[PDB]
């Protein structure tokens, strides 16, 4: 039980970060803005700083208030 859970979590961990890796290779090698005028994929690149700054708020809020509670404890 210990091996079969931990195996398919790191196997899940490596596969999930490769989805974003080959998602990042998509925007360089395969993305065409003239083909993708105004779709949902280009609106991702349009408000792309709103995505990253709101992730950077959630990650910063959680790290402040999870570590801060453990250090308090």
């Amino acid at each position: 039980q210990a091996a079969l859970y931990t195996h398919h979590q790191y196997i899940a961990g490596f596969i999930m970060c490769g989805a974003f890796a080959h998602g990042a290779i998509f925007f360089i090698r395969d993305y065409d803005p003239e083909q993708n005028k105004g779709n949902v994929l280009a609106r991702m690149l349009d408000h792309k700083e709103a995505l990253i700054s709101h992730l950077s708020w959630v990650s910063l809020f959680l790290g402040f208030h999870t570590l801060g509670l453990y250090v308090h404890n």
Binding site: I28, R29, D30, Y31, D32, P33
Partner: protein, 144 residues
């Protein structure tokens, strides 16, 4: 008036007791680059391969294994001492090639007669996307 000076290896070396940072076996197989300058007075410069050599009056012949090792020598021979050197490229079949003032004038100043290779008559922000240059035989930058 200027064209393509040749070399004699008769010209004396700077007085330098030899360093371990000098040539290697690449000089005997691939290429090694020799450098000449005309010194007015006897003074002490730094070897780019570590140490210090003294130059003597008249021509001075020195040899290296890289191109940066010669141009990082002329950089301290032109800026510090206001000499006018030029370095060549020697192949082990005896062939020699003239390199640095390749049209006489140093490359910071216009010669009006050198040809403008490797230029784009367009702006760097106006490159194409890599989807257009995909399957170009080899992997290829969109700036081509």
């Amino acid at each position: 008036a200027w064209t393509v000076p040749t070399l004699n290896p008769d010209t004396p070396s700077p007085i330098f007791g030899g360093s371990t940072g000098g040539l290697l076996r690449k000089a005997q197989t691939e290429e090694f680059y020799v450098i000449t300058w005309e010194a007015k007075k006897e003074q002490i410069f730094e070897m780019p391969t570590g140490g210090a050599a003294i130059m003597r009056q008249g021509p001075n012949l020195l040899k290296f294994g890289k191109k940066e090792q010669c141009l990082a020598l002329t950089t301290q021979l032109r800026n510090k001492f206001k000499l006018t050197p030029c370095f060549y490229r020697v192949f082990p079949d005896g062939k020699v090639q003239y390199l640095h003032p390749a049209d006489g004038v140093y490359p910071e100043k216009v010669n009006a007669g050198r040809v403008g290779a490797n230029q784009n008559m367009r702006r760097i922000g106006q490159n194409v996307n890599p989807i257009k240059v995909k399957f170009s035989g080899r992997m290829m930058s969109p700036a081509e």
